[PDB]
Structure formats: C-alpha cells, structure tokens
C-alpha cells in the first residue's frame, strides 16, 4: 500500500503490456471490501484533480453568454451560447456528437433550467450536465482543475476503475495521481484505505497487475 509498491505497479503494468501504435493509457482498480453498497451514502461519485493531469487534458465545453462565453473564448473552450440550446435540442445527432467530445460542462447558472429542458436528455445520461457558475464567475481556475479532472463511480458495486495518466508519463506521476484517488477512498470512510481489498494497475491494452 506504500508508494514503492505502487512504483513496482506502475512499473510491472508497464512492462507487461505489449507495445502498440497508441499513446496508452494507466487506469487504477480498486475494489472494496466492508463497503454496503446498497446504501446509497457508502456509493462514490467524486471528481479528484490529478496533481499531474490525465496525460491528455480532459476537454471542457461552456454554455453560457456575456462574459463567460467570452472567457471560454480566451480559453480556448467550445463555447454554446444561450440561442444554441434550443438548435441542440433539435440536432440530438449532433448534441450526442458534442456530449461524446467532452469530458465536462460549465454553465451559466441561470441558464441551467434551459439547458436541463433540452439538452439534458443527452448530457444527463452520460453523467456530463453542466456544473453551474454564476454568470460573473472567473471559470479560469475551475477550467484549469478540470482539465485535469477524473471522476471516480462505483456506482453500486464494490469496486472502481478510474484514468491516472498516460504512458508518456513517469511512474514517479501515475503514482502521485494514484495517490490523489486513493485520498478520496481514505477520507470518505472512517476506516479509508483499510476498505481496500485489492488494487490494481494497467495500461489500456496491458495486463492487471496487483498492487502488492
């Protein structure tokens, strides 16, 4: 459970996997062990920052007017502006097409019933409705964290697998963001770390390897 076993992880994970034409990417396995996730309290969905990114930036769209939309601009978001919705709303191939592209929504808070009557349909579903922002927020800090945003689900099963960055990077990083989950689990239980019955490590195409 200590970083230089995770180190070994990463390592092992990395060397096990048979190179390929693709930048790969390091997810984490955990599964839970005491945890009752029946009770809806015990279920995780929380977004973790990871100290060293995702490997590749998690894609961000904004939907909002005034001086957010522009903000977004600077940022160089996609932007949806408030007219937009609607004609969303219409072309679900292309609202589907816009939601698979991004990774998380920021909206305008005022907008949020709006969007939720017209796009939701789609972003609800697939877990990306828009986190609200009043509309004269400063989204440049909120945009720089979820750039480098995971989330973790375990939905209703004892276990979750969540994206720690990318081959390109170094295990000394994978492990930093490992760390970073791991976090989550020992703050959101009384017992943390103590519920984790077995980790693991593995590239996209590679073999789990076990955590100690």
Known sequence: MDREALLQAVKEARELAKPRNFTQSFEFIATLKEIDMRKPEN??????????????????????????????????????????????????????????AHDFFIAQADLMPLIGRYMGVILGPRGKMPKPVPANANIKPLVE??????????????????????????????????????????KKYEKGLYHIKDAYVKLTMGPAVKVK
């Open 43 to 100: 279920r995780i969905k929380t977004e973790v920052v990871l100290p060293h990114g995702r490997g590749k930036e998690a894609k961000i769209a904004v939907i909002g007017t005034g001086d957010l939309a522009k903000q977004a601009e600077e940022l160089g978001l996609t932007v949806i502006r408030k007219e937009e919705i609607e004609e969303l709303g219409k072309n679900k191939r292309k609202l589907r097409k816009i939601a698979k």
């Open 145 to 186: 964290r979820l750039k480098k945003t995971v989330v973790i689900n375990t939905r209703d099963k004892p276990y979750f697998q969540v994206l720690v960055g990318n081959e390109k990077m170094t295990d000394e990083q994978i492990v930093d963001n490992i760390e970073a989950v791991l976090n989550v689990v020992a």
